[PDB]
Design an enzyme around this catalytic site. Structure first.
Site, short mmCIF file in Angstrom:
data_model
loop_
_atom_site.label_atom_id
_atom_site.label_comp_id
_atom_site.label_asym_id
_atom_site.label_seq_id
_atom_site.Cartn_x
_atom_site.Cartn_y
_atom_site.Cartn_z
N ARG A 1 0.77 -1.13 -0.02
CA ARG A 1 -0.04 0.02 0.10
C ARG A 1 0.98 1.29 -0.10
NH1 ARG A 1 -2.95 2.58 4.83
NH2 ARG A 1 -4.32 4.08 3.83
N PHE B 1 1.88 11.00 0.63
CA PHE B 1 1.47 10.27 2.11
C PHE B 1 2.43 9.38 2.71
CE2 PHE B 1 -2.08 8.00 4.38
CZ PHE B 1 -1.58 8.20 5.77
N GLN C 1 3.66 1.77 2.70
CA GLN C 1 3.37 0.69 3.60
C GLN C 1 3.85 -0.69 3.38
OE1 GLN C 1 -0.53 1.31 5.43
NE2 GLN C 1 -0.51 -0.90 6.18
N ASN D 1 -1.65 0.25 11.95
CA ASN D 1 -2.61 -0.35 13.00
C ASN D 1 -4.02 -0.54 12.49
OD1 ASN D 1 -2.12 2.52 15.19
ND2 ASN D 1 -3.93 2.02 14.02
N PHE E 1 5.02 1.88 8.20
CA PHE E 1 5.01 2.97 6.91
C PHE E 1 5.94 3.89 7.24
CE2 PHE E 1 2.70 6.57 8.97
CZ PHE E 1 2.17 6.07 9.88
N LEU F 1 -1.88 11.82 12.34
CA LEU F 1 -1.34 10.55 12.94
C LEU F 1 -0.97 10.46 14.26
CD1 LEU F 1 -0.34 8.83 9.63
CD2 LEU F 1 -2.61 8.62 10.50
N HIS G 1 -0.50 6.42 15.86
CA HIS G 1 0.46 5.62 15.43
C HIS G 1 1.74 5.86 16.17
CE1 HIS G 1 -2.09 4.15 12.08
NE2 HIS G 1 -2.56 5.12 12.21
#
Length: 164
Positions: free
Chosen positions: A54, A59, A62, A101, A112, A121, A125
């Protein structure tokens, strides 16, 4: 000092190079230890051979689902999931290494690398390191992402381990 670990990354079966990460074991020892051991593979499993599944441009990239290769899987060295250790380190900009998560206290093995400041985040995270070297490799990975997170090239961690 803090562990230095590496990921060697292919795209469509050709090497992009190496990402070197410092793990902030001084701040988040349990989270750092999990990632370190998953890089060496010393518990009999880990990141070697797994993918960046991903990737979203502007951004993050991942990876870490070495059981299901799709975002649903992964496991830690402690068990399937482990708690959020703390939220002390922040998502301050590109190069930040943080745990993916599925809500509070669901850390496993997915992680990531940010390509921008992701301040929303913070407190959600667990940040546990950053890119020491190889941001060029991270930008290559990023460039093979999409809005949906679907990758346009097969991005594989061919080798990984600990440098110090």
């Amino acid at each position: 000092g803090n562990p230095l670990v590496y990921l060697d990354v292919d795209a469509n079966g050709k090497p992009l190079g190496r990402v070197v990460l410092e793990l902030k074991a001084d701040v988040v020892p349990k989270t750092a230890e999990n990632f370190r051991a998953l890089c060496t593979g010393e518990k009999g499993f880990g990141y070697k051979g797994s993918t960046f599944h991903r990737v979203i441009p502007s951004f993050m990239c991942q990876a870490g689902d070495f059981t299901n290769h799709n975002g649903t899987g992964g496991k830690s060295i402690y068990g399937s999931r482990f708690p959020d250790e703390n939220f002390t380190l922040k998502h301050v900009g590109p190069g930040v290494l943080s745990m993916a998560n599925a809500g509070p206290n669901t850390n496993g093995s997915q992680f990531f690398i940010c390509t921008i400041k992701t301040d929303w985040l913070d407190g959600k995270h667990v940040v546990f390191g950053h890119v020491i070297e190889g941001m060029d490799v991270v930008k290559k990975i990023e460039s093979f992402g999409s809005k949906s997170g679907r990758t346009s090239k097969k991005i594989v961690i061919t080798d990984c381990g600990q440098l110090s």
